[PDB]
Amino acid sequence: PFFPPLYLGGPEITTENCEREPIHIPGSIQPHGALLTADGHSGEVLQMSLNAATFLGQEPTVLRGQTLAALLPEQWPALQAALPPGCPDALQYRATLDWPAAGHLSLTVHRVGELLILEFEPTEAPHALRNAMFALESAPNLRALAEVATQTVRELTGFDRVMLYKFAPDATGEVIAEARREGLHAFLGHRFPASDIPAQARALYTRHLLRLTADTRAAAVPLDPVLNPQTNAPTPLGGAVLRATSPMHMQYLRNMGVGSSLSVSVVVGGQLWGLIACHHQTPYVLPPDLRTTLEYLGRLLSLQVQVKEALEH
Amino acid sequence: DPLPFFPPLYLGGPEITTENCEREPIHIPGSIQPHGALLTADGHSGEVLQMSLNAATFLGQEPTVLRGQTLAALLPEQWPALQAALPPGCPDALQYRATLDWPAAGHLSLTVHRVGELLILEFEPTEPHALRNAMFALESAPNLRALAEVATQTVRELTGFDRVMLYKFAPDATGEVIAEARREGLHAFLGHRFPASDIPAQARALYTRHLLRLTADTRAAAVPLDPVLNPQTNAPTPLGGAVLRATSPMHMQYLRNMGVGSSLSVSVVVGGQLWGLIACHHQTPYVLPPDLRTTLEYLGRLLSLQVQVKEALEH
Ligand SMILES: *C/C=C1/C(=C/c2[nH]c(/C=C3[NH+]=C(/C=C4\NC(=O)C(C=C)=C4C)C(C)=C\3CCC(=O)O)c(CCC(=O)O)c2C)NC(=O)[C@H]1C
Ligand SMILES: *C/C=C1/C(=C/c2[nH]c(/C=C3[NH+]=C(/C=C4\NC(=O)C(C=C)=C4C)C(C)=C\3CCC(=O)O)c(CCC(=O)O)c2C)NC(=O)[C@H]1C
């Protein structure tokens, strides 16, 4: 099963109970964005991140009464149609708001049962993706495909290190390709125990395909209330990219000297084949539109891995 | 019966009838569609060899001036990028794309690929979260039918085409329209089947490697390359990888007879075989700009993946 989260007086995580940390329900988010939850029917704002006032520019109480209808007039009917009752928690809808306080915000919404989860992040506003797609497809074998993928991602993102991390049948991981800035350790060829990515994190990574830590020293921002009014239970945040990263894993990143971390799941035959794993030495908020490019690349790599593995077997 | 290609018309080959469909050498028509321009150049020196006859009007230069310069001089910023992206021996399927600001012609999209020692350069005029939203909707579709319906509707919304169909090949290469989105008033093609010769065997092979082709105007005359043969080889210039390549006259007559002014199709490739086609029709001529066509190319790949996934959920 899972332990209760901390804020419901559950045990603190150690290397003895790695498998039982409820990483999906931390009750908090990373501070480079803001999150609201809301009722599926009424559009009634039920929870907000204590930092919402910053991003939205709204007097705190104003929000926690109001309706999405009021708050987001153009958007609220689109949401209603895009995310019908009963849809999967994996389905997401995005829009760009030109919002008074903040030039442009990206809005990302998904639905978990009766709750809409809304994420707001700063945003903005060429051929590198098309060029990359063809490059991946003409790679002659899996090894070269891995090399092209890591190089392409590094060029698109500027990340200090990009790896392709492949899982063995026992969930033992191996760095099979790597693109990195001059003057970093090389993790190419190294293998790592399955417990570094514990079972409950691999399962969530099979369904929700991109996650990140933007700053491995930033404090999480609580949800208020912490419990969902609807249920008097924790809000599931595993489909939210703003979801606070497990401190156990933030500690693992700080000990490596990493300030910023992102990965994309590569999913083949319904199973987690590997990760595009990215490191930055300093804090780094990759903007939403560039993340989208990596999300596309994730799908394309999933296709090409199967194609390429089929021409060996 | 499968038989080798006839020589093209310009090398004294025969004219194509219902009898000899499968032997038309559609990859080497010696000509392009008039809404863009094409140059060929030597892959090592960058000497310009062939150009479409309309090139002066896209590029704003006399032929003899174009042909008298190397790509190093014509494309000083792109020439080194081309050479890195398209190394000798690379496959003909690999494409490099850039946007140019050309004085006379505005923003041009440049698409380049390499066939042996030849570079092929295509120039076309070029111009929010719809793709991301579509990607997730496709993935959440519960079964093959719902996927097919979401895919057709999405493509129609992105493009404004009068008809978008998902055409699926059977094992005998006959095809069936298994989903479609269509303009009000058009008659349904859903559930209809069409014989294997409708898309002959040398088109199907080409459609497994080069995943998008189009006819922007089913009545437009093709524009010859000049000279027609590659001076490197005194042989035909391979245009199978060029979206500008002229469509087979057989296929154009087939489309005009259906009342179609514009056609586009994307290949859906599963396990190395052509599974089906995203096939679009417009009643009037219609040019879809290169950046919009890129969205369809990306959806072609997504759909190939999702078709595998939906079919595996099915035994
Ligand atoms: C007591 C449990 C431990 C633990 C927990 C844990 N680990 C993750 C997720 C990841 N761990 C990763 C490990 C590596 N990163 C590398 O670069 C290498 C090798 C060079 C390894 C072995 C990775 C890549 C992830 C994925 C996330 C990312 O992209 O950074 C989680 C889940 C965190 C979350 O999503 O909130 C958890 C709870 N890790 C341990 O090492 C043990 C001590
Ligand atoms: C004697 C040969 C004939 C022939 C040739 C031919 N066909 C193609 C390619 C295509 N044919 C298509 C036919 C259809 N369009 C539809 O809407 C339906 C069903 C409702 C069918 C059966 C299609 C879709 C294609 C693909 C390209 C496209 O138009 O989007 C070629 C190759 C064309 C080229 O790349 O230059 C050729 C030579 N078709 C016949 O019917 C016989 C008489």
**Sheet with strand B212-215: strands edge to edge:** B193-194, B175-182, B163-169, B273-282, B262-270, B212-215
* Separation of alpha carbons A190 and A171, rounded Å: 14
| Helix axes of B130-140 and A288-310: crossing angle, nearest 10 degrees | 50
Residue B205: which of B251, B250, B256, B269 has the closest Cα?
B269
Contact B297 A96 (CB under 8 A): no
Contacts of A302 in chain B (CB under 8 A): 305
Q: How many CA atoms lie within 13 A of B222 on its CB side?
A: 17
Contacts of B132 in chain A (CB under 8 A): 92, 94, 292, 295
Report how far apart, in Å, the C-alpha atoms of B144 and of each of A295, B140, B141, B310, B314 are: 23, 11, 8, 6, 9
Q: Measured between CB atoms, does A92 come within 8 Å of chain B?
A: yes
Contact B305 A303 (CB under 8 A): yes
And the tokens for B307?
Answer: 């078709």
And the tokens for B252?
Answer: 């154009």
And the tokens for A157?
Answer: 């993102």
B1-125+219-247 and B126-218+248-315 have identical folds? yes
And the tokens for B34?
Answer: 């008039």
For the domain A123-216+246-313, what is the CATH code? Answer: 3.30.450.40
Out of A90, A126, A300, closest to residue B99 by CB: A126
Breaks (C-N over 2.5 A) in chain B follow: 127
Whether residue A225 is preceded by a cis peptide bond, meaning omega within 30 degrees of 0, is yes
| Resolution of the experimentally solved model in angstroms | 2.1
Residue ID of nearest Cα to ligand 1 atom 39: A196
- Pick the residue of A110, A131, A306 with the most B CBs within 10 A to test the interface with B by mutation: A131
And the tokens for A194?
Answer: 């399955």
Q: Where are the alpha helices (DSSP H) in chain A?
A: 52-56, 60-65, 68-71, 75-82, 128-138, 142-157, 199-207, 247-255, 288-310
Q: Is the Cβ–Cβ distance between A188 and A175 less than 8 Å?
A: yes
- DSSP β-bridge partners for residue A211: A263
- Pick the residue of B108, B122, B132, B270 with the most A CBs within 10 A to test the interface with A by mutation: B132
Q: What are phi and psi of A215, to 5 degrees?
A: -150, 115
Residue A121: which of A141, A142, A146, A102 has the closest Cα?
A102
Q: Is the Cβ–Cβ distance between A75 and A88 less than 8 Å?
A: no
Hey, what long-range contacts does B220-223 have (CB within 8 A, 24 or more apart)? Answer: B220/B33, B220/B34, B220/B35, B220/B285, B221/B34, B222/B29, B222/B31, B222/B32, B222/B33, B222/B34, B222/B246, B223/B31, B223/B32, B223/B33, B223/B34, B223/B52, B223/B53, B223/B54
Residue A93 per-residue DSSP state: E
Contact B309 A270 (CB under 8 A): yes
* Separation of alpha carbons B158 and B133, rounded Å: 12
The burial class, CB within 10 Å (0-12 / 13-18 / 19+), for B257 is exposed
* Separation of alpha carbons A160 and A298, rounded Å: 19
* Separation of alpha carbons B67 and A126, rounded Å: 30
* Separation of alpha carbons B108 and B36, rounded Å: 10
Under 8 Å CB-to-CB from A225, ≥6 apart: which residues? Answer: A46, A47
Task: Please report the sign of the dihedral spanned by the C-alpha atoms of residue B7, residue B10, residue B11, residue B17.
Answer: positive
Map tokens 């051929």 to a residue: A127
Rg of chain A taking only CA atoms, in angstroms: 20
And the tokens for A266?
Answer: 């590569």
* Separation of alpha carbons B248 and B25, rounded Å: 9
Map tokens 């809005």 to a residue: A107
* CA B199–ligand 2 middle distance (angstroms): 5
Contacts of A310 in chain B (CB under 8 A): 271-272
Gap from A106 CA to chain B (nearest CA, Å):
10
And the tokens for B219?
Answer: 């009545």
Contact B99 A137 (CB under 8 A): no
B1-125+219-247 CATH choice from 3.40.50.1000, 3.40.50.720, 3.30.450.20, 2.102.10.10: 3.30.450.20
Contact A95 B304 (CB under 8 A): no
Q: Is the Cβ–Cβ distance between A45 and A67 less than 8 Å?
A: yes
Q: Measured between CB atoms, does B129 come within 8 Å of chain A?
A: yes
Out of A96, A131, A303, closest to residue B85 by CB: A131
Out of A94, A138, A302, closest to residue B90 by CB: A138
In chain A, what are the domain boundaries? Answer: 1-122+217-245, 123-216+246-313
What is B99-119 written as a DSSP string? Answer: EEEETTTEEEEEEEEEETTEE
Q: Which residue of B has its CA nearest to A91?
A: B136
Q: Is the Cβ–Cβ distance between B252 and B131 less than 8 Å?
A: no
A1-122+217-245 CATH choice from 3.30.450.20, 3.40.50.150, 3.40.1740.10, 3.50.50.60: 3.30.450.20
Q: Is the Cβ–Cβ distance between A75 and A93 less than 8 Å?
A: no
What is B121-183 written as a DSSP string? Answer: EEEEE----HHHHHHHHHHH--SHHHHHHHHHHHHHHHH--SEEEEEEE-TTS-EEEEEEEE-
List residues near ligand 1 (CB under 6 A): A 15, 18, 21, 23, 173, 175, 187, 192, 195-198, 201, 211, 245-246, 248-249, 252, 261-263, 277
Q: How many CA atoms lie within 13 A of A50 on its CB side?
A: 11
Rg of chain B taking only CA atoms, in angstroms: 20
Q: Is the Cβ–Cβ distance between B165 and B279 less than 8 Å?
A: yes
Residue A115: which of A233, A241, A243, A203 has the closest Cα?
A233
Q: Is the Cβ–Cβ distance between A234 and A248 less than 8 Å?
A: no
Q: Is the Cβ–Cβ distance between B275 and B221 less than 8 Å?
A: no
Contacts of B98 in chain A (CB under 8 A): 127
Q: Which residue of A has its CA nearest to B291?
A: A127
Q: Is the Cβ–Cβ distance between B43 and B88 less than 8 Å?
A: yes
> In angstroms, how far apart are the furthest CA atoms of chain B?
62
CB atoms within 10 A of CB A15: 7
Map tokens 């009007």 to a residue: B57
Interface A-B, measured as beta-carbon pairs within 8 A, has a size of: 72
* CA B247–ligand 2 middle distance (angstroms): 10
Angle at B141 between CA A269 and CA A207, to 5 degrees: 45
Residue A87 is assigned to a ligand binding site: no
Out of A91, A134, A137, closest to residue B136 by CB: A91
Contact B301 A303 (CB under 8 A): yes
* Separation of alpha carbons A78 and A93, rounded Å: 9
Give the H/E segment covering residue B310.
Answer: helix B290-312
* CA B254–ligand 2 middle distance (angstroms): 7
Is the beta carbon of B234 within 6 A of some atom in ligand 2?
no
Report how far apart, in Å, the C-alpha atoms of A111 and of each of A93, A218, B194, B298 are: 10, 27, 42, 26
* CA B308–ligand 2 middle distance (angstroms): 25
And the tokens for A154?
Answer: 């590094």
For domain B126-218+248-315, the CATH class is alpha beta
What is the experimental method?
Answer: X-ray
Buried b (16+ CB within 10 A) or exposed e, B177-211: bbbbbbeeeeeebeeeeeeeeebbebbbebbeebb
